[model samples]
Target: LLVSEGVLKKIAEELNIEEGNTVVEVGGGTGNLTKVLLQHPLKKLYVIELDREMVENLKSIGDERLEVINEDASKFPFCSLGKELKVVGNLPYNVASLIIENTVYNKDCVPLAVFMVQKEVAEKLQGKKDTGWLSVFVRTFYDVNYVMTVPPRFFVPPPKVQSAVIKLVKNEKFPVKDLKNYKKFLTKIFQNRRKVLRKKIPEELLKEAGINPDARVEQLSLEDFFKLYRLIEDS
Candidate 1:
């Protein structure tokens, strides 16, 4: 009931989710949140879980809208199952990065995923500070916004770090649908965010890409990165 009732409702309400839409709930531990979501008028609820006991327990609900699938969410199936997928979950803190990466990159079933993850992980996702590869990678697919911070005291066995709620709305202005070797170059340039692109990246390369040599990685916004990427594409 935790998965369906608690978390799902928050997502549905915050994201303005509607009925007749499929929601894949990962880490559906004991279906806690699932119960609450079922109370709502949803079309379908797919639970992919690693816990054996939780899977069996969810069966007790016996609702037609619910489908309990036993699987490791880190490497779970991304197929749409012929339904509109809006993924929601109280993610496994350890593998939050992996799940988030998979969600944004899964071209096959890259449904709009709204997730509650570890606070540190959520901040990194939103590129708050020390933005890394995962930040830029997801930015290509979505705009991550830090919505709320969940305190540690809320949990039964509170974790070491406080958690956060992050909303990942897909970027409507994805300039490049397909990026090639440029992905490798982007990582290199942003590795030293404070350094000028020309110093970190080769000057000839910037000239070839049609980007100003003096521009720093932080100087470019996500959309600006797309423009810069295209400059390199033509170079």
Candidate 2:
């Protein structure tokens, strides 16, 4: 749980909440971050909290604009909240992966997101180290912008390591649905990060895209993977 007022402010700051903007805070634990978001002039702010005990405190947050929804964030109807959203939250560390993948990723009508996630997840989201296939896959859907790191002390029952906040800006022309081919392609790439991409793609196609035919997946740069995905779809 995020308890540091400073880091909470940063989460809100990253949203850049503006007029008529609607936002959501998934796993709104005890409503700490929720209060900061309420300070904004957002049209509405939905706090989806799973714990029944927590919602009691969340209800008293006391703003006409705040609606406390006692539900799981795993499959909230983002589109039903109305067109376009800024998803900002301190995702629960345990099940955060499922919530992000099933609830947030490829979600329709979500233009931006700011999440306080475990540090390791940030690496793939920001493509910090390996710049591996997961990095490439995420970048195609949302441009990941690294935000400030929240020290372990910032959290309640503080984690042993650091936590990271990241902002995701959606790709306007990116696929909204029907992701079959993309899924297969991405899975094949990750199955062997050390394996040469040439086995998976034709050499002539790689030549046309100007991607090195024998390069290992992780060795490729960010845009290097981007152009390969684009080239394959184009082919």
Candidate 3:
């Protein structure tokens, strides 16, 4: 089942698919979103659909600006799209997180992503009060926001779970310089969210890092994590 016309129009309007930029639509099932995106003036519209039948349907649109590719969206080469690439998709629920991770991790590739995902997953992406590794990792690269919620019945055959649309705009202003070390430190501490910092590192070290030894990983902000990472490296 694909997203409805109203939803598709909303995505197109909000995306604003700027001129002279390449836009990639993942899982272009039956060309619903594809047709809507084509209505906008774009440098290129790359439709990546894994299913051969769907790819053929996309090709049938016969738009000169549309390039239909048959490949798994999760493993697709984002670098080929060049800089400032914009993306949109009604992502397959199963691999949605994987695809988002892939896009975020690739530097200078995709700067913006407007996507539809499971409602629960969308909340996590928006970094609710309680968060996990994914929340930290994603927020490291882009600022995320919930745009709209879609009921299960919005699709042709209603999905079991409701979905929401989110916009992730790259945080070009993020001031981190040592991303590798920062990521390593994040993975280490957050692996045990409920465990006290004193159990993982010395109380003196936690205090020196400007963190409370009793603080749980979930309670720490992104800035707190960065501070801890810097102190760990300096020591």
Candidate 4:
């Protein structure tokens, strides 16, 4: 949907594709990005694209290393492909929440996830933009890093907003076995009851979790945030 061989190359470079690295390209509308990906020496590349026309375009590229999979990545069963996956590609707007389904849950298998997304959604994933539970949950399993920012001009028609690429690597100090009701607990605290951390957060919970009732939302570290996760992990 976008233009710029430069931005495409920039996205691939961040992949840090290594030998024996099994990569999964989420959406390959055209082979432009996959073309750059093929230039790398990585072991194998799986292009999960649904568009038949695009799949034809991808197939024509004709590299034994590249396998064109006609499927929707947002809902793809990644584990079926086996372990140690490195995911990359320009993601559709709707795939933001679905990214968790593809990347996490199968947690230990996927080490890195690189994707080009609109700047607004990119910011939320970084958790610096808001104290939302989605950010909190994402940061729980991955070490986030911002790679590049593509301006509107990078796209053909120049979309309304800018785009950005993020890199996520898993190195959890205290591994979260499963999400369970953690998000369920935070939905009440962060969303429906937005901002003002202490709104619905009972004082006893704060006391037990060792968080300040009057603490600045921005000031509290994510480490402090996970305390609440373990506190009500099964809730």
Q: How big is the positional error of residue 198 in model 2, measured in Å on the Cα after superposition?
A: 2.8
Error of 2 at 130 (Å): 3.2
lDDT of 1 by residue, 1-235 (tens): 1232344567656555576777777777756667766766778888888687787778799899888777777777556464357777777777888788767645335447777787778877677876677777788877787766666554445335677778777664554554435457567777877788878766776676567789877655665566656665553
RMSD of each: 3.6, 2.9, 2.6, 2.6
Weakest 10 consecutive residues, lDDT, candidate 4?
186-195
lDDT of 2 by residue, 1-235 (tens): 6458888998899999998998988876757788889888899998878787788878776798888777778766767766787888887778766566644454567888888888888887677775544556567678788898877782356337677898888874354244556656777776766679788778887777778889877666655655666766743
The 10-residue segment with the lowest total lDDT in model 2: 172-181
lDDT of each: 0.69, 0.74, 0.78, 0.76
lDDT of 3 by residue, 1-235 (tens): 4678899898877677778978888887768888899889998998877787787787678788988777778887777766767889888778998788767666467778899898888888777845766777778788897889998773355336788999988885345565566566667787776788788877887787688999888777877766666665643
What TM-score goes with each of the models? Answer: 0.79, 0.84, 0.87, 0.87
lDDT-better candidate, 1 vs 3: 3
Candidate 2: which stretches are off by over 4 Å? 102-104, 154-159, 171-177
Clashes of each: 13, 0, 0, 0
Q: What TM-score does structure 2 among the candidates reach?
A: 0.84
Model number with the top TM-score: 3
In model 4, state the lDDT of residue 170. Answer: 85
Q: RMSD of candidate 4 to the true fold? A: 2.6
Enumerate residue pairs that collide in model 2: none
Residue 11 CA displacement from its true place in model 3, Å: 1.2
